[PDB]
Amino acid sequence: DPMVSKGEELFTGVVPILVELDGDVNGHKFSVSGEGEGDATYGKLTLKFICTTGKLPVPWPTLVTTFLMCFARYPDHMKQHDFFKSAMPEGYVQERTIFFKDDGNYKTRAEVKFEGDTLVNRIELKGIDFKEDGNILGHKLEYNYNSHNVYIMADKQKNGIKVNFKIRHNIEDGSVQLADHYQQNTPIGDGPVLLPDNHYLSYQSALSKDPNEKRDHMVLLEFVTAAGIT
């Protein structure tokens, strides 16, 4: 299928990635840069993010979802449902509202596309209505991350997809902070895209620290696999 080919020929091997984020949460401004690589053959991403403005004013775990669904591994039987690769190289826009139960919300706009051989994710993030002393602005979330499925459905009238899901971040006292994600993606180009049947992506995420890094940062290892269309 020459449409499936175009996506295979873009993602076949290891692809370099660059991430850039500008954020303002409750007027606490910050910028983050990430670099790493993805190998969609294995659904694998390896990334390191650095807060280039100093201290990150929110917990690194709260940004993991915001910081590349094009690197999902779609099983062979599911390749006709991979919207994300089908939009490349022109890319797609990924927008979110993330509602932190009993606290503030993040609104995010990203553009994911190739710049030459490099896959780029440019993000603006605005957070409003946070509690200065809540779990987020008060840094009470643990530095870890649970596995989650993400359910993708077509958004046919917008030539794109909608995605809905809950992340539960562990709090230091042993409870959980719910982060309800609402998401929409639309292609940046005017060409055809694969609009999927309902399926999900399964995420595993591991957070760590670079022992030789003195700046505020996060090392992120993710594996992502499509399923749910037997």
Side-chain angles (χ1 to χ4, degrees), residues 203-230:
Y203 275 79
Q204 300 117 248
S205 316
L207 309 198
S208 60
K209 292 287 184 184
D210 169 4
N212 304 315
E213 183 60 66
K214 303 197 181 302
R215 295 169 289 185
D216 206 356
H217 76 287
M218 169 173 66
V219 168
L220 171 61
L221 172 64
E222 253 176 11
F223 293 93
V224 182
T225 306
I229 298 170
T230 87

Side-chain angles (χ1 to χ4, degrees), residues 141-142 169-177:
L141 308 179
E142 285 183 354
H169 296 293
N170 300 348
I171 305 173
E172 45 185 19
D173 70 2
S175 188
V176 278
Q177 165 77 62

